[PDB]
Design a protein around this ligand. Structure first.
Ligand SMILES: Cc1ccc(/C=N/NC(=O)Cc2nn[nH]n2)cc1
Ligand SMILES: Cc1ccc(/C=N/NC(=O)Cc2nn[nH]n2)cc1
Ligand SMILES: [Cl-]
Ligand code: NA
Ligand code: NI
Ligand SMILES: [Zn+2]
Length: 330
């Protein structure tokens, strides 16, 4: 078996290998990449997402989110407080202000130490989940707005035609903006391109060990666990690498820099943070190997994890026994 220790693998496709997206995902899996839950893909030197980022300041962040923490430095939740709309230009200025800017630091490891020491004492503002794309329409390779849809994948694999659409999202980040521990909706894949700016550090648990993380989370967030059998779906819980190590949870870490893609694999729990002002684009996708994960994915039915209407058909077809209860939650 390839990659038995579940290490995060880094790939350097040639321009020829970058033509056929599905084929390259399958290639990475043939090398065991999925065992880690996360892979990095460095595009060929000839490729670009768009010509420049000089013209993006007028994008609107209609509902910036202030990420307010509670708990202890290494075990905390965050809630999102809505703020007034701002443009990307205004957001960049805010990110670079003395209150919010990245502190002096020696290297990525020093910055990581500062993040876990101090994150809870600040409330950064995140411009997350903005429907849109920054890929040029003429970019033909790895354009996240031109991938095969999950609806077409399900139809091709299972013969069922379903409603729903699948479009990318933009994320504008600043120092300390945080993504909580989660898997994707229906345990889908995700792909993530860091268009510009400062890095994003990722933590990931191998899919084969996801239940270990779930068990620890139930111990560490006992009230939340009583409220919902899939509370990690709420995307609010953080556990530091130190706490994971103390509890024997298998995980890996890596930092993504501008110009790099990250793929998360079905049932790969991940979390992380932004180093400073940046912009990422991401979308969920499926392959034939996803179907059996989608069939088995846990669901939140407590009300908290409201999601896109495109997930209706996925639950309805893949999880008919669970559908009525999940729908009540929506
Ligand atoms: C197009 C474009 C490309 C790169 C950037 C980088 N910006 N880097 C910071 O702003 C550093 C910082 N972030 N928070 N505190 N300091 C901006 C625009
Ligand atoms: N899947 N990709 C993520 O979870 C990454 C992410 N989410 N929010 N900010 N970054
Ligand atoms: Cl700090
Ligand atoms: Na490891
Ligand atoms: Ni994710
Ligand atoms: Zn729930």
């Amino acid at each position: 078996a390839q990659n038995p220790n579940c290490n995060i693998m880094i790939f350097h496709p040639t321009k020829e290998e970058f033509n056929d997206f599905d084929k390259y995902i399958a290639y990475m899996e043939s090398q065991g990449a999925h065992r880690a839950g996360l892979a990095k893909i460095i595009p060929p030197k000839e490729w670009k997402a768009r010509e420049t980022y000089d013209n993006i300041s007028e994008i609107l962040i209609a509902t910036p989110l202030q990420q307010v923490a509670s708990g202890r430095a290494g075990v905390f939740t965050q809630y999102h407080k809505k703020k007034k709309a701002m443009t990307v230009g205004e957001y960049r200025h805010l990110a670079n202000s003395k209150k919010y800017q990245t502190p002096p630091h020696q290297n990525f490891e020093d910055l990581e130490r500062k993040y876990w020491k101090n994150r809870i004492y600040n409330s950064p503002i995140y411009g997350a989940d903005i429907s849109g794309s920054l890929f040029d329409e003429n970019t033909k390779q790895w354009n996240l707005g031109h991938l095969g849809t999950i609806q077409d994948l399900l139809e091709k694999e299972c013969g069922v035609v379903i409603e729903g659409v699948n479009t990318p999202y933009l994320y504008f980040g600043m120092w300390k903006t945080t993504f909580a521990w989660h898997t994707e909706d229906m345990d889908l894949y995700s792909i993530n391109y860091l268009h510009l700016g400062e890095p994003k550090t990722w933590y990931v648990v191998p899919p084969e060990h996801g239940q270990r993380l779930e068990r620890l989370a139930r111990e560490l967030f006992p009230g939340s666990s009583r409220g919902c059998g899939a509370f990690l779906r709420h995307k609010v819980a953080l556990i530091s690498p130190t706490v994971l190590k103390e509890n024997g949870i298998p995980f890996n870490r890596i930092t993504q820099e501008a110009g790099e893609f990250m793929v998360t694999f079905p049932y790969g729990y991940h979390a992380g943070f932004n180093h400073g002002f940046n912009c990422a684009e991401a979308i969920n996708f499926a392959t034939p190997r996803w179907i059996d994960y989608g069939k088995m994915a846990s669901q939140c039915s407590c009300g908290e994890a409201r999601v896109t209407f495109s997930m209706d058909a996925f639950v309805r077809i893949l999880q008919p026994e669970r559908y009525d209860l999940w729908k009540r939650g929506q």
